[PDB]
Symmetry: C3
Subunit: 256 residues, 3 copies
Amino acid sequence: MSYQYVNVVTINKVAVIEFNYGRKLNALSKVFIDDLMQALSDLNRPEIRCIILRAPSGSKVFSAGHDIHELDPLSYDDPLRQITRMIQKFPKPIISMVEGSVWGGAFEMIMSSDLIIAASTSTFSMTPVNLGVPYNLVGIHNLTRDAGFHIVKELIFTASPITAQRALAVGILNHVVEVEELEDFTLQMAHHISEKAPLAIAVIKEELRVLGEAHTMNSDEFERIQGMRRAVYDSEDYQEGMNAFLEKRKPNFVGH
Amino acid sequence: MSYQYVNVVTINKVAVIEFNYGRKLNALSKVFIDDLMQALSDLNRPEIRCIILRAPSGSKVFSAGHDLSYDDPLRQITRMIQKFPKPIISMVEGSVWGGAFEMIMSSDLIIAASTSTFSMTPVNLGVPYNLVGIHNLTRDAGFHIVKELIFTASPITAQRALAVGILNHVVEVEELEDFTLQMAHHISEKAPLAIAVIKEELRVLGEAHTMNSDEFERIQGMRRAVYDSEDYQEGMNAFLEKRKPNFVGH
Amino acid sequence: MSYQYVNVVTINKVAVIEFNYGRKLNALSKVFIDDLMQALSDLNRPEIRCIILRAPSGSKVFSAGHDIDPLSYDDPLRQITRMIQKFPKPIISMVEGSVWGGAFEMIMSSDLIIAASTSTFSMTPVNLGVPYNLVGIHNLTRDAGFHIVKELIFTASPITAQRALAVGILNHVVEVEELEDFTLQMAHHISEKAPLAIAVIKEELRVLGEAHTMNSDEFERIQGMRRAVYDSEDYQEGMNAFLEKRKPNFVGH
Ligand code: NI
């Protein structure tokens, strides 16, 4: 019924899960993610038909992304890994209602959701290259189903932020609205969907999930990528990137 | 050479298949689809280079859709349209609904009137759409967009359809026919064999999302659960009974 | 380093590879491609972090594309697209002028595409009756949707830089006067990021992008069709018409 790190409300058949982790700017800490997951789980009932994920009204930062301090950081059972999986497999639609700036891991988190509705002032950025992190295959895969290849590559390689208007243009966002209408706009849609056949929505969603994951390869290729990842994890650049982050200074990458 | 449900006209290398089932709003009935398929088949000749599918001029409704086994009409037509060695352009005028949307999605190009509208509606009736069918709807617009389309069953405008990648071109209704024909004639000057093989290569790549038998069987199990649900009955009912369904999750 | 068909200049951590074959409109000749590949290869050093591919300033034609199974594993275009894709540094295609045929696939295979508001693009295999290969076709499907791709290929009609942007092919469109500066700045910016991270992600993206698999029978079946095209009358006609600079007359056989 209650959680330390999220606040939940139910409005008819729609449930809203609001973050309650502001000190860390909603960074994806284990305790935080665990509460989000418990909440979702608790909401997996016939009477609940649609979920909305959001940061508190007026938030400057929607989510800072991975919790560096807490630091292979992207292993199967890591929080971010677990949540994306859960969200994707959840039999009810999940809408990310965005207010504030979205960063790295949080960006992957919202991409994994079903729909994204955002304020005209929100911003988006994918940042593993800033810290020198060798992002995982599944993680990367999750960022390629909406905008095209070139676009995705620009986001990742530059780690530069994009406006909500651009995010809408490239296919990332569903709708962009004025912050004052965000909540209202999102709820209307949620209630609308909640009037539809839940069982059909569930199956279609899973069909989409399964098709979306269907980029297959042989074990040698996976092991080869994994070897590359290890090499990155073992590099100087990797240490340099984390420190600089922790040290709140510009990193000096050298290619080894 | 002649059909009950469709009218065909050939202009040099271009063939126009026009629906003739307005009384039923061009619903995807077996009879209708059977004629569509026959007409396509009859047009599979070296001298025909490009096909155009359309509803009669001035139509308010392009197709109402349904009236999902491997051999059901809709499944049959999408496969056929996809394997057809000639390009097939859907020239849309009017509102597009359900099965009809998948049908045009399965085609090579879609050119529509500035006033046309589109909706996928399986969630309105509680239908557990099939994997192949859903797959057919994921090659043009992004995942988040498709999910919105499908989950809301809300109509979108021709302008949004264009913006998200579903449509090739949107034009004033008065110019629709000519714009389409000109593009068709132009394609007809190109190498047909090359077009054919490239279309097929695209088709094969497009289907190349593979999975194991267990996954397939698992989805099949889920689908069956849907067809066996109360909600499913309620959905068919309400449609018939022309009333809003009351879904409950069982 | 030096090459006959391309020029190279390094600016800090960025390297610019410029085509030097205007006499032939930068057609994708073997000797041209070989040079490009060597230049990339020579640039595969820790101090180089980003690459820019471009045609000379002012070019009216970025690349005419193909020069007279020509699409075999070891053909130049086949080799260069693989190279570009496997290159552990980002490769940005900076476009000024018109882009044609193979050159279009070439830029598509790169990481980002930034172009002049006046540039244009056309996929032309259907003009000549060429049975494009699977890998080649695949390379053209990761940016714009299916319907759009099919229109480009089926019509072989050129599209504007504005439309290329709108359908997802291009990253940015800029006024020629600002093309260079805009491109360089981004490249410099990329150069400040973690190279190793970039390389692994790029390779992950490549592997995922190729991951549309099929059985041997399907592939052989495609090959058989391709071969039938190559053996057709229309194939001869397309090549001849092109040489004789006259409109081809295709018949379906
Ligand atoms: Ni795919």
